[PDB]
Design a protein around this motif. Structure first.
Motif, PDB file in Angstrom:
ATOM      1  N   UNK A  18       0.849  -1.196   0.000  1.00 31.38           N
ATOM      2  CA  UNK A  18       0.000   0.000   0.000  1.00 31.38           C
ATOM      3  C   UNK A  18       0.883   1.244   0.000  1.00 31.38           C
ATOM      4  N   UNK A  19       0.718   2.159  -0.962  1.00 34.60           N
ATOM      5  CA  UNK A  19       1.595   3.340  -1.020  1.00 34.60           C
ATOM      6  C   UNK A  19       1.382   4.323   0.115  1.00 34.60           C
ATOM      7  N   UNK A  20       0.294   4.195   0.877  1.00 34.97           N
ATOM      8  CA  UNK A  20       0.087   5.059   2.032  1.00 34.97           C
ATOM      9  C   UNK A  20       1.103   4.780   3.131  1.00 34.97           C
ATOM     10  N   UNK A  21       1.507   3.523   3.297  1.00 38.32           N
ATOM     11  CA  UNK A  21       2.433   3.118   4.353  1.00 38.32           C
ATOM     12  C   UNK A  21       3.719   2.636   3.692  1.00 38.32           C
ATOM     13  N   UNK A  22       4.584   3.583   3.342  1.00 40.35           N
ATOM     14  CA  UNK A  22       5.876   3.315   2.713  1.00 40.35           C
ATOM     15  C   UNK A  22       6.875   4.286   3.334  1.00 40.35           C
TER      16      UNK A  22
ATOM     17  N   UNK B 369       4.770  10.869  11.239  1.00 39.63           N
ATOM     18  CA  UNK B 369       4.861  10.670   9.793  1.00 39.63           C
ATOM     19  C   UNK B 369       4.827  12.054   9.156  1.00 39.63           C
ATOM     20  N   UNK B 404      -0.177  11.393  -0.552  1.00 40.70           N
ATOM     21  CA  UNK B 404      -0.588  10.038  -0.195  1.00 40.70           C
ATOM     22  C   UNK B 404       0.382   9.438   0.814  1.00 40.70           C
ATOM     23  N   UNK B 405       1.678   9.703   0.640  1.00 43.93           N
ATOM     24  CA  UNK B 405       2.696   9.128   1.511  1.00 43.93           C
ATOM     25  C   UNK B 405       2.606   9.672   2.932  1.00 43.93           C
ATOM     26  N   UNK B 407      -0.172  10.044   4.640  1.00 38.34           N
ATOM     27  CA  UNK B 407      -1.491   9.714   5.162  1.00 38.34           C
ATOM     28  C   UNK B 407      -1.423   9.418   6.656  1.00 38.34           C
TER      29      UNK B 407
ATOM     30  N   UNK C   3       6.259  -6.448   3.542  1.00 36.14           N
ATOM     31  CA  UNK C   3       7.619  -6.267   4.031  1.00 36.14           C
ATOM     32  C   UNK C   3       7.999  -7.252   5.128  1.00 36.14           C
ATOM     33  N   UNK C  19      -1.943  -3.771  -3.474  1.00 35.05           N
ATOM     34  CA  UNK C  19      -2.557  -3.185  -4.658  1.00 35.05           C
ATOM     35  C   UNK C  19      -1.891  -3.823  -5.872  1.00 35.05           C
TER      36      UNK C  19
END
Ligand code: AGS
Ligand code: AGS
Ligand code: AGS
Ligand code: MG
Ligand code: MG
Ligand code: MG
Ligand code: ZN
Ligand code: ZN
Ligand code: ZN
Lengths: 228, 628, 48, 547
Positions: A18-22, B369, B404-405, B407, C3, C19
């Protein structure tokens, strides 16, 4: 002997986290997946899925004894299902039909359907009536001479800021069976109208996207219609 | 044998001497003795405690200090330093037997114990690694720059024969080179054998690029880099961009047919990591009760405002705004249909030299974050989601962008005024629906962008105009300007005593920074902010209705009377959201009347400071009761 | 999570969310294939 | 047995790169060139160890002559085959190996040709004595290296066919031979490396003072002992330029620089001083930059239009169409702890300005192109010369109005020197006399108080000192900043640009540079007053039309 042989289909998928949690300084990681038989063509790219499968090994010809991992897909579950023409369903259960006919006999149907449009927005009852008429639409035509007359209605809402116009647009996007909420200049990376680009793998023309073609048979809520 | 006999070497090289069976048995016996009866003359055996700790924590990593082994058996320390490979293998076996002695069932669950050597005395930089360090233990500092994914490497390899089908026994795979077999022991054939991954055991493998830290590089020279190989328990312990100190075997990588470009038999070198030491928002029960103890005092919120950006002086209002943005309100969805945003967006509009970027880097350090982006710069993560193809990896990647990153976090946008059209559309979509839609390269989806936004901007012409309102002083249009809850305008107006204090503060900071020479502590404040953000969730009750609705109607009439740009419902929404953030500062489940009054004060102060000065003179007198 | 996939999950059933970037074209695999020898004319069937 | 390296040096004649010929292959030579790229220190197989496959017995001490070889002797009599062997790098012996790429010097390039590079290889103790961006004299042997790129070149390429005359053969049946091409290129294998001065002609003070002898250190002491040392330093900078004492002061303080301080929280205070010169055409703005690049060590000269984003900071370049990518240092890295001179900064486009202010603010260059990620150092003072919009300097506009360069560029320049061309009889007469006297008298018209070498020695001696603010100096800084801001308040729009906290930091940096000029350890309020005077005279007033 090919005429007496039996074949099936097999598909390769590529799944990213998911790109939100990277982490901010890291490229997001992905895995290759193999599915076959009735598990192929069950998902479209971009959807968020949960994959059950065997974490397994293949050797691809950076480490003297190193292996590339992949996933043997055994089942696919979709968290959310996107709305489109091909993803739409037209079959109805009989109890749903009885409920929908019983709803229609209510003489106060106009009032309940106008009150159910954005109950959290105070006032603007005529705009709610406009929203109901927008959602129903009219009768499409195919005339004998070949020219068609549309049945869909277009409603513009222009006025002073802070008047729940964007909230009405968002509610129409949430309540419609098929709807796209976009701006006048499009989205962050999703264009407006229709975008024809070349295929990334075969360099051939195809329709990439656009709010009005993804929401065919539905509603596009265009905020900030003036800047365009 | 004895240690004195171990000092004398009979073979040609150290490795050949240690490979001898009686010598290896002596090494194992002495290592077991050191592992068992070493004490620091305090009545406590530290290594037995470490073995018990790793047994009860179900870990395969044993940390052995090098200084203890050096003072206990110095010949073993020299032998470990010179030829670390088979010595580490022998000590892994010794430690495995030692933890088997305490835990008899530990063999069937792990069957492998890794010894992590710590506190090696010598420290090398990456540019002074030479021919003498090959196949020896080195300790190098560096920044992790990029890392690869975790891959499975063969550990206990099982083969199958293609004639009879029998699965052959496990063979240990060393990390040096591939293993192979040619005899079946069932059908007695030398034909093709195949590795099956179903019965083969694997270990984790990672590759990390280690670069010299720029503070230690000589002036004209470039920073050197190395490849560090991380084994099963060392994977994913060092994120890119952080400074670590890695101990490991400096060995020679093998490549087929050497290098043809050089014309010389040039070898590449790698560092197989034995241990990694780094040069976390986890709170305990003591941390929880400390948070409650520091919550009940009356003036904590001001102290929180006192703790934001200690290096910035005199800018109290914007410190309050950033503190409210860091804490935030709660987002809500009444009956599913109607969604109300719960995080505060702050816009710091200021003349150059007002230290907005320092505050942005403070939020980067403080927030859980925090994702930093800029408009004019290029060496940063973008605000636009994209689907990009790597030219070398030849694979596609879906990047959500900075919005988005970030969030459930915060996005820090520097130079908000000079973004292009694409970033402006991305920002508008991020504050409008809290989501970003992408339709690119066959990918059609939406991504959650529930990110609080703190932006920094400069006025048009580089100097703010007091006679002209904020709308014509920036390049931002009305829809993107109205989404910010707080509009903090800072102007570097001339003031004799204020310049005196600012000059003294800056000069004192310069003097205290020379190498030749009431606020909350930051490490507590970080976990306090995270705890308040993730556990409080305040709610405001029904009999506070009669005051905010009164002040809203009171101030809309004043805004009509002064003829400014109107106050709309989102101003009341921002008042309520800032009030619910003030409740999270106090760790309170309810919003008090004082929080409502303070939120009304900060919103009114933000609204009147964005006005034309003719409007300002009327509005400060009109809203004197709420500003106080 | 993707991960957290280690070597302890190899040849084990795992559940992981994510995704999807791309779905490839449908390759054709063979379930039942009949084979004939080139000169020997021996007919055999392989079911996979 | 250790490896002995014989280093020869001080040859009678030093040859260029273009004077390298094929008759000198395998002969002792001394060449010179500018190092542009360097490689990582790598092990080179010197004395290999091999196991025979059939013997399973190892042999040691096998000499490796350039290309990888395997012995065919096989002294173990177990087998009868010679070709098959296996290499063990564990007990094999290696040597240090570095490949540094050198380029032709700027004065050695012919009339129309581009510079040609050469890959010179250092082994043993000579490794890492070559640094990217300086002129070096390499003494060694001209060697020859196999080359594959000469396949498509015109001309008969030599080949090596196996001679079959004494081999008896039979036509029994059941005709292939091994023939290889002999294509080669010239390389250099250096045994001694000496780094000559990048100019035309180590932070601790003790290690620098042990380097100098008695007469030179006595000259340094008598030059320090002079009470008028500052005026001598100012008038000794750029003697070809007449007038412009303020620009010479700024250039001298830029060469001296300030100290670098790191705050406890982690941010770093910039000690480098950046100078920008703006004004009318033909006001000797480029003469200052030419003097700085010809005088200051570790200094590079750049044109604004001819530069590039990858050329100014760092470039990722692909060699020989291979999978390997290399980092080539840009102009900001060859001027690390030096001065980067940029004429025509206005002619530089927006993208390169962004790429250079990233390195100005962060003092680092970040690389993420291709498969290479890196962070490189760019601690570099910048000397920029820019023209106003429309060519002439419009006196009626502000400093920001005349310059098209971006605000992040403008905010990081400590001193702006605006040079105005005013036609007066005696100044023009003296300037014309100076210029024609220079043209007539060559070097005899240039009579600086200090020569270039002793000036460089004084600069190197003074850069070791780290000045300290005193108790009265802090209060004097505060009062100076307060009165500068009061001057801004009473000037309103009359100032070219307003004094902010950045001007206070630049005042501290200039005071540190001035304290370095007088070779003291504590900063005197007189130095603060001089720095304040310099910064005040840097800013000029804008004229407004009468109403
Ligand atoms: N009559 C209303 N009833 C309920 N909420 C309202 C009403 N009017 C405004 N709001 C709220 O006030 C906020 C202002 O947002 P919107 O009014 O939806 O934006 P908009 O002004 O309509 O669109 P613009 O012109 O592009 S900013 C939202 O949180 C709305 O829910
Ligand atoms: N109130 C203040 N307290 C402490 N330091 C300050 C203050 N105001 C300015 N400074 C210092 O002045 C300098 C300003 O640097 P920046 O934060 O980069 O300026 P800025 O606010 O980003 O405005 P720009 O970048 O010119 S648009 C820094 O060295 C700050 O530490
Ligand atoms: N004050 C001066 N002292 C000595 N020579 C000068 C002076 N002013 C001009 N010159 C000479 O006049 C010429 C001016 O050349 P430049 O230094 O290139 O002028 P410039 O100030 O750089 O203006 P631009 O930007 O190049 S149009 C040179 O030949 C200088 O030697
Ligand atoms: Mg709106
Ligand atoms: Mg800034
Ligand atoms: Mg010039
Ligand atoms: Zn078999
Ligand atoms: Zn057959
Ligand atoms: Zn042999």
């Amino acid at each position: 002997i090919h005429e007496s042989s039996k074949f099936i289909d097999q598909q390769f998928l590529k799944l990213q986290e998911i790109p939100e949690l990277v982490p901010v300084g890291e490229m997001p990681r992905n895995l290759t997946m193999t599915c076959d038989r009735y598990l192929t063509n069950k998902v479209i790219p971009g959807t968020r899925v949960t994959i059950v499968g065997i974490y397994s090994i293949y050797n691809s010809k950076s480490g003297v004894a190193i292996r590339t991992p992949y996933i043997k897909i055994l089942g696919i579950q979709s968290d959310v299902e996107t709305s489109s023409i091909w993803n739409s369903v037209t079959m109805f259960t009989e109890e749903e039909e009885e409920e929908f006919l019983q709803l229609s006999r209510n003489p106060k149907l106009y009032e309940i359907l106008t009150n159910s449009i954005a109950p959290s927005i105070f006032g603007n009852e005529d705009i709610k009536k406009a929203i109901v008429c927008l959602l129903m639409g009219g009768s499409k035509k195919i005339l004998p001479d070949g020219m068609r007359l549309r049945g869909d209605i277009n409603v513009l809402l222009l006025g002073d800021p802070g008047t729940a116009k964007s909230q009405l647009l968002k509610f129409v996007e949430k309540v419609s069976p098929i709807a796209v909420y976009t701006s006048g200049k499009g989205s962050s990376a999703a264009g407006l109208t229709a975008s024809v680009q070349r295929d990334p793998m075969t360099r051939e023309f195809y329709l990439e996207g656009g709010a009005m073609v993804l929401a065919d048979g539905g509603v596009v809520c265009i905020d900030e219609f003036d800047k365009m | 044998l004895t240690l004195e006999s171990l000092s004398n070497v009979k073979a040609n090289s150290y490795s050949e001497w240690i490979t001898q069976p009686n010598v290896s048995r002596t090494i194992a016996r002495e290592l077991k003795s050191f592992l068992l009866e070493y004490t620091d003359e305090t009545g406590r055996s530290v290594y037995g405690a470490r073995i018990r700790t790793l047994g009860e924590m179900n870990s395969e990593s044993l940390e052995v200090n090098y200084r203890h082994l050096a003072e206990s058996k110095a010949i073993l320390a020299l032998f470990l330093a010179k030829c670390p490979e088979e010595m580490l293998k022998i000590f892994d076996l010794v430690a495995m037997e030692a933890t088997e002695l305490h835990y008899p069932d530990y063999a069937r669950i792990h069957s492998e114990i890794h010894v992590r050597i710590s506190d090696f005395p010598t420290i090398y930089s990456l540019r002074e690694l030479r021919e003498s360090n090959l196949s020896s233990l080195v300790r190098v500092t560096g920044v992790v720059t990029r890392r690869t994914g975790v891959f499975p490497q063969l550990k206990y390899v099982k083969f199958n024969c293609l004639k009879c089908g029998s699965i052959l026994g496990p063979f240990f795979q060393d990390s040096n080179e591939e293993i192979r077999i040619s005899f079946c022991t069932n059908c007695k054939s030398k034909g093709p054998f195949r590795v099956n991954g179903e019965k083969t055991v694997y270990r984790n493998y990672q590759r990390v690029t280690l670069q010299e830290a720029p503070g230690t590089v000589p002036p004209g020279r470039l920073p050197r880099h190395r490849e560090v190989i991380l084994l099963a328990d060392l994977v994913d312990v060092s994120k890119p961009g952080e400074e670590v100190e890695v101990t490991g075997i400096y060995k020679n990588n093998y490549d087929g047919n050497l290098n043809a470009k050089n014309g010389f038999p040039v070898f590449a070198t790698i560092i197989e990591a034995n241990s990694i030491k780094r040069r976390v928002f986890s709170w305990t029960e003591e941390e929880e009760r400390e948070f409650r103890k520091i919550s009940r005092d009356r003036g904590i919120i001001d102290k929180i405002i006192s703790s934001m950006a200690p290096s910035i002086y005199g800018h109290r209002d914007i410190k309050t705004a950033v503190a409210c943005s860091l804490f935030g309100g709660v987002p809500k969805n009444v009956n599913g249909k109607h969604s109300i945003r719960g995080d505060i967006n702050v816009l710091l509009l200021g003349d150059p030299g007002t230290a907005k970027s320092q505050i942005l880097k403070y939020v980067e350090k403080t927030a859980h974050r925090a994702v930093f982006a800029t408009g004019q710069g290029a060496s940063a993560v973008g605000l636009t989601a994209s689907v990009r193809k790597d030219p070398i990896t030849k694979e596609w990647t879906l990047e959500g962008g900075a919005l988005v990153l970030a969030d459930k976090g915060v996005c820090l946008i520097d130079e908000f005024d000079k973004m292009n059209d694409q970033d402006r559309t991305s920002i508008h979509e991020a504050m409008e629906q809290q989501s970003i839609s992408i339709s690119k390269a066959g990918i059609v989806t939406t991504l959650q962008a529930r990110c609080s936004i703190i932006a920094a901007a400069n006025p048009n012409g580089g100097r703010y105009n007091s006679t002209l309102p904020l709308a014509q002083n920036v390049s931002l249009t009305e829809p993107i300007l109205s989404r910010f809850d707080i509009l903090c305008v800072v102007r570097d107006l001339v003031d004799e005593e204020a310049d005196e204090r600012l000059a003294t503060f800056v000069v004192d900071s310069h003097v205290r920074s020379h190498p030749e020479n009431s606020p909350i502590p930051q490490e507590l404040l970080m976990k306090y902010i995270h705890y308040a953000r993730t556990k409080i969730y305040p709610k405001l009750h029904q009999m506070d209705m009669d005051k905010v609705s009164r002040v809203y109607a009171d101030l809309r009439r004043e805004s009509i009377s002064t003829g400014s740009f109107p106050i709309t419902v989102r101003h009341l929404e921002s008042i309520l959201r800032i009030a619910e953030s003030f409740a999270k500062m106090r760790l309170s489940e309810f919003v008090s009347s004082y929080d409502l009054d303070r939120a009304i004060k900060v919103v009114v102060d933000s609204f009147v400071d964005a006005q034309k000065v003719s409007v300002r003179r009327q509005l400060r007198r009109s809203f004197a009761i709420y500003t106080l | 999570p993707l991960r957290d996939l280690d070597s302890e999950h190899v040849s084990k059933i795992v559940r992981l969310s994510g995704i999807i970037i791309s779905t490839s074209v449908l390759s054709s695999r063979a379930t039942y294939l009949s084979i004939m020898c080139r000169n020997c004319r021996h007919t055999t069937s392989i079911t996979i | 047995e250790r490896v002995f390296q014989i280093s020869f040096f001080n040859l009678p004649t030093v040859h260029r790169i273009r004077d390298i010929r094929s008759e000198k292959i395998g002969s002792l030579l001394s060449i010179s060139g500018t190092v542009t790229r360097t490689s990582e220190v790598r092990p080179e197989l010197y004395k290999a160890s091999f196991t025979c496959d059939m013997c399973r017995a190892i042999v040691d001490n096998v000499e490796q002559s350039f290309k990888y070889t395997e012995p065919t002797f096989c002294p173990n009599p177990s087998c009868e085959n010679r070709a098959f062997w296996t290499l063990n790098v564990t007990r094999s012996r290696f040597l240090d190996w570095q490949k540094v790429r050198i380029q032709e010097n700027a004065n050695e390039i012919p009339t129309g040709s581009m510079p040609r590079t050469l890959d010179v290889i250092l082994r043993g103790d000579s490794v890492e004595r070559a640094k990217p961006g300086d002129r070096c004299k390499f003494t060694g042997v001209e060697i020859v290296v196999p080359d594959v790129t000469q396949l498509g070149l015109p001309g008969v390429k030599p080949s090596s066919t196996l001679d079959t005359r004494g081999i008896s053969k039979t036509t029994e049946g059941l005709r292939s031979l091994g023939v290889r091409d002999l294509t080669y290129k010239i390389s250099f294998l250096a045994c001694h490396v000496i780094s000559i001065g990048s100019n035309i002609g180590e932070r601790d003070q003790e290690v620098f003072l042990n380097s100098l002898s008695s007469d030179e250190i006595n000259e340094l002491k008598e030059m320090v002992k002079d009470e008028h040392i500052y005026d001598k330093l100012v008038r000794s900078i750029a003697p070809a330029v007449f007038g412009h004492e303020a620009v010479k002061k700024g250039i001298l303080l830029q060469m001296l620089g300030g100290v670098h301080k790191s705050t406890v929280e982690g941010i770093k205070l910039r000690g480098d001083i950046n100078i920008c010169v703006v004004g009318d055409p033909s006001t000797s703005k480029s003469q200052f930059l030419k003097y700085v690049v010809g005088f200051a060590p570790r200094s590079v000269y750049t044109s604004g239009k001819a530069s590039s984003a990858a050329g100014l900071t760092a470039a990722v370049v692909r060699d020989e169409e291979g999978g390997d990518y290399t980092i080539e240092a840009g102009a900001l890295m060859l001027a690390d702890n030096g001065i980067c001179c940029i004429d025509e900064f206005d002619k530089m486009d927006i993208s390169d300005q962004v790429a250079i202010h990233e390195a100005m603010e962060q003092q680092t260059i970040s690389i993420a192109k291709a498969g290479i990620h890196a962070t490189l150092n760019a601690r570099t003072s910048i000397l920029a010369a820019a023209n106003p919009v429309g060519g002439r300097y419009n006196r009626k506009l502000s400093l920001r109005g005349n310059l098209n360069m971006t605000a992040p560029i403008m905010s990081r320049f400590d001193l702006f020197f605006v040079i105005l061309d005013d036609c007066n009889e005696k100044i023009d007469t003296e300037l014309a006399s100076h210029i024609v006297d220079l043209h007539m008298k060559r070097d005899e018209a240039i009579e600086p108080p200090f020569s270039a070498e002793q000036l460089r020695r004084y600069i190197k001696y003074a850069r070791t000192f780290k000045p300290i603010l005193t108790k009265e100096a802090r209060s004097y800084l505060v009062e100076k900043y307060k009165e500068l801001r009061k001057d801004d308040a009473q000037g309103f729009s009359r100032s070219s640009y307003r004094i902010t906290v950045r001007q206070l930091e630049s005042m501290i940096r200039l005071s540190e540079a001035i304290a370095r000029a007088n070779c003291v350890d504590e900063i005197t309020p007189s130095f603060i007053a001089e720095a304040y005077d310099l910064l005040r005279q840097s800013i000029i007033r804008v004229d407004v039309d009468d109403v």
